[PDB]
Amino acid sequence: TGLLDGKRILVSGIITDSSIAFHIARVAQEQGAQLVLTGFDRLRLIQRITDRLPAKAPLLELDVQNEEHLASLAGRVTEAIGAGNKLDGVVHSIGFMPQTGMGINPFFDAPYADVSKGIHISAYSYASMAKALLPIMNPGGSIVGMDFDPSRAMPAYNWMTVAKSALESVNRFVAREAGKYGVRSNLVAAGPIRTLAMSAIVGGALGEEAGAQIQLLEEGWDQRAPIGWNMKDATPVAKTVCALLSDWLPATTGDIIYADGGAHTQLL
Amino acid sequence: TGLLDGKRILVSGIITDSSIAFHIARVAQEQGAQLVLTGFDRLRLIQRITDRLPAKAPLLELDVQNEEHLASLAGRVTEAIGAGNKLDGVVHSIGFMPQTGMGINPFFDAPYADVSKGIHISAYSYASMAKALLPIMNPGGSIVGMDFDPSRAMPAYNWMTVAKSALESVNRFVAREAGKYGVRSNLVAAGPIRTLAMSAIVGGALGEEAGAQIQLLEEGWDQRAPIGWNMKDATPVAKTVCALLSDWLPATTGDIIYADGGAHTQLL
Amino acid sequence: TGLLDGKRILVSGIITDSSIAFHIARVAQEQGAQLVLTGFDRLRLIQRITDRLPAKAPLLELDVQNEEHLASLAGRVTEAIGAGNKLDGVVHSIGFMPQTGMGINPFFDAPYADVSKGIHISAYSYASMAKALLPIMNPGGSIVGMDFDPSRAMPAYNWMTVAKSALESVNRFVAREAGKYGVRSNLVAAGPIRTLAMSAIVGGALGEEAGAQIQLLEEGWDQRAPIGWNMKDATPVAKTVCALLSDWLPATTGDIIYADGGAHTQLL
Amino acid sequence: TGLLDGKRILVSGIITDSSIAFHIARVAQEQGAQLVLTGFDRLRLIQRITDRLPAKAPLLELDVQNEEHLASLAGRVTEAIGAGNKLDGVVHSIGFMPQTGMGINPFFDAPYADVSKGIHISAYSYASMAKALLPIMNPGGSIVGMDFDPSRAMPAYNWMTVAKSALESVNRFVAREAGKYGVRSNLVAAGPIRTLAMSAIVGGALGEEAGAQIQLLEEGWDQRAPIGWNMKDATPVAKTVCALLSDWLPATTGDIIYADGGAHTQLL
Ligand SMILES: NC(=O)c1c[n+]([C@@H]2O[C@H](COP(=O)([O-])OP(=O)(O)OC[C@H]3O[C@@H](n4cnc5c(N)ncnc54)[C@H](O)[C@@H]3O)[C@@H](O)[C@H]2O)ccc1C(=O)c1ccncc1
Ligand SMILES: NC(=O)c1c[n+]([C@@H]2O[C@H](COP(=O)([O-])OP(=O)(O)OC[C@H]3O[C@@H](n4cnc5c(N)ncnc54)[C@H](O)[C@@H]3O)[C@@H](O)[C@H]2O)ccc1C(=O)c1ccncc1
Ligand SMILES: NC(=O)c1c[n+]([C@@H]2O[C@H](COP(=O)([O-])OP(=O)(O)OC[C@H]3O[C@@H](n4cnc5c(N)ncnc54)[C@H](O)[C@@H]3O)[C@@H](O)[C@H]2O)ccc1C(=O)c1ccncc1
Ligand SMILES: NC(=O)c1c[n+]([C@@H]2O[C@H](COP(=O)([O-])OP(=O)(O)OC[C@H]3O[C@@H](n4cnc5c(N)ncnc54)[C@H](O)[C@@H]3O)[C@@H](O)[C@H]2O)ccc1C(=O)c1ccncc1
Ligand code: NA
Ligand code: NA
Ligand code: NA
Ligand code: NA
């Protein structure tokens, strides 16, 4: 008996086999969940990647900046899962910030249009997905988004940290709306994970100083974490998302669960 | 397949059929856990109460202010579960504050000896149980304690709120030690639950004004909670404790999980 | 000897005699500060309003969404205060959210373009003013912005609360940059103040339910505040801003000071 | 015109010329305050030390664990300042934890009697001083205590961190009582200061590993602080205490002001 047996769950945010969402989707399928996937722009690529998941799942296009995609999404999901069925879960694993808003590009030099695009994709879209999908969610359902703890400023992450602060605030409002449907809304604040993009950044893609700073941050994270932190292993994060999708945290909403090795609880 | 199948878990804090720990123990057994119980002082009473749990579990005496009890505890547990077996989980569901430290007795009028007894039982003892039991815990294990959010001052709870603030700090240090064993340490911050003691307090046992204030607090809690809060139902709390005892929050330690309906995330 | 004697301070955000910034400016002048004022759009109106301040102060136009205004601002300030002089202080008292983002208009129904405009004005602009002005600030200087505590969701404030969460994050990054100049950056989180706009909202301008909710929030604030809260009196807020502008909080930066009667420290 | 002209202020916690309280007292006198001092045990020593303050101030004995001292304190203060006069300010700069509760002595090995003594002196006593002194405080008055940010666990500080967590909670309750008198209660959370005791600890007095860890913590603090941190300079801390004693933070109570260089706002 899987943790998520018979649950119907939408998972956004797969782009590579290193996406946190890929691991969320693998774990959820291992636990009995029936999935619908959403992808942005490179659908042929995403399908090829998702062919490696343990079970079949339909893939729907979703650009969160596209109002038409959002307006049609619930109907497209219902067609995929069948009329008369609703979702039990939704995973938001979507984030973006233009290069001007991250790395060695100075914090003050990021144009607002770039920051605004990043906030749109990384924070506002959590509300936009909830608006689209709550009408097709069952009572007892769960919406989960991916977060990085923004309560203190960090090198390099710059405006992405600001976007996460906005996301945390959005989640608290989404919980008010979601509760009317009997649905929970929460974020998982993960420690650093070496996705393709993060590996590129560590390698200097957004400047050497920024890569060096991120490498220092990752090392400090494992050091501070009482149980350690493995940046090469997304499974503990995926498991935590599944815990929130399950029936086992039924009184938690508007909240943040930290899948970070405990690092945020320790100064040094 | 239960959430906790094959896990060996110690549960402290049962005194009545309304104890949060009673519900923790029922749920954990429903999920396949094999339990050892600890009780304070009234062992015949506790045995009679625990006869109503769905499965048998040995009951061991533990007064957390008694150093001899603590020194012998791991040996007594090992005898109960069998040599060569260790615990996978520990639940601390223990709290006390003398009457002078709660209710209408003025905050300033509580003698230190009373406050100190309350802190001993309610906060220090989380460290004392961990010291006793970590040497008989398996890697991957989990220690969970019960908390009430003390980040803002409240009427009536007075020095018990101070004790919880101390407990939260103790948990963060216990996580450092526990991590050396591969063990997690976390608290569950519950909303208000109408245990026998709380019902007595609402009824005026610690003064009418204090009862009135607590009644107001409970009503506000349900109002603020986006998914509501039922003070007569401990099951959602028990489920959350079981989530932390399980393998599904493997990267969370030194932390607090709020089983409170989301109330702490909303101002009004 | 005034608290701010000989300090040169820029104050943004005056639009009426009820603006928090008007009071900040009056108090700072009472304490010896020499001011430069900035205003948005209705300059003749603002001049007429500012004629009531106890001392003369030049008024410069600043629309924070106008890159040309921002690019020219330091030069315009220097002309006002004289070549070879720099500022010791900067006050950001600027906020806006379109009606779709506040009140009874549903949270989900706010278009991104509206939210983005609000975030631009209310959060990003704190970075944009700092970028413009740090090059003309003295060591030991202070940048202060106005904040409302967004750590928990509230009725009616909706996307403005999200904007404040973003502002708090921006302040922490601005402090990193400002520190290179020997300059502090902090926010003052005020309790509710009955400005003209807030009075209109309480009166129903953004819907009756929203007005009712805000009225309830204000009453709860005075109740929770251990020293009370007078929503008709901005002076305690203005004084707190002046404290941060002064030499008396020299080791505080990236931070938030709560001028709220202590309400955020109390649950009830 | 000094910041504190004509204010009558009690300052506890002087033991050496490196005590944070010595600097608080020097700065307050420089700003016009008339002081009463309290000292523990070594009164001849304290008098000799306080002879170096810029102005005369009476010294009263106060052991905060001595109920008789506390019961007589207001009468002794009134005799010192004259009948019909009251205090405007109170500074609590008192802390202690036995060696078993700090350094390399393992966290689990601290006996409760030692922890309890530390909590008594370091946390409960903030309530005990307020109880004693509020009846002789003027409206508009201010009580300030010294704090170190305990929200995350640290090496070496061990049970002292737990005591600070308790102190923060006590302050929030003291603010409720103090508000009835028109009096504010707040803490100043300082960065690390090289007092004699701290220098001894860095030098290995509580074990080499603990000294090494504290040295690492101090270095990280200056690094994280956007405006830097000088552990050899208590003046910025003293100034912040004086800001809270003044009339310039009139709407802040139950709160914590961080005089730490901004370090707590930055991850790295
Ligand atoms: N290190 C990490 O990899 C990391 C990642 N996350 C979050 O996890 C989520 C998933 O990102 P990932 O798995 O890291 O990486 P990713 O690059 O695999 O996935 C990002 C996804 O966003 C999608 N996306 C972008 N623009 C759009 C759009 N217009 N419409 C729809 N989708 C779009 C894109 O297609 C892709 O699938 C994001 O919310 C991240 O912020 C959270 C925490 C950590 C983190 O960044 C961090 C930082 C600081 N301290 C600790 C941790
Ligand atoms: N309302 C509640 O019932 C409530 C209870 N808790 C915690 O849950 C835990 C269990 O208490 P309960 O189930 O409420 O009540 P309870 O009275 O059933 O159990 C308390 C237990 O402590 C035991 N105990 C006392 N002294 C000793 C000792 N010397 N040695 C060993 N054991 C001892 C006692 O035998 C009993 O089993 C405690 O940590 C509580 O603080 C947490 C949160 C809420 C809460 O108080 C609250 C307050 C404010 N906002 C929200 C929630
Ligand atoms: N209640 C309040 O009045 C209140 C106000 N503040 C902040 O105080 C600051 C000043 O606003 P106020 O004094 O309330 O009101 P206001 O309407 O007098 O001033 C707002 C100013 O923004 C200016 N502005 C708008 N758009 C632009 C632009 N394009 N370029 C430049 N300037 C522009 C405008 O000209 C005006 O001067 C803002 O940051 C508010 O968010 C902070 C806290 C409280 C608050 O909203 C609150 C909410 C919840 N809990 C507690 C408190
Ligand atoms: N580093 C520091 O020196 C430091 C000190 N403080 C606080 O500042 C306050 C003053 O201590 P200090 O100036 O450091 O040192 P201190 O040793 O000069 O003074 C401590 C005082 O306590 C007095 N005391 C002890 N027992 C009693 C008693 N029975 N009755 C009455 N008085 C008694 C004693 O006489 C002495 O005057 C305490 O509350 C400290 O916790 C706050 C923050 C920092 C800090 O410890 C820290 C830790 C971690 N991150 C950052 C900062
Ligand atoms: Na570690
Ligand atoms: Na469910
Ligand atoms: Na509710
Ligand atoms: Na496990």
Ligand code: NA
């Ligand atoms: Na009040």
Ligand code: NA
């Ligand atoms: Na200065």
Ligand code: NA
């Ligand atoms: Na620094």
Ligand code: NA
């Ligand atoms: Na005053």
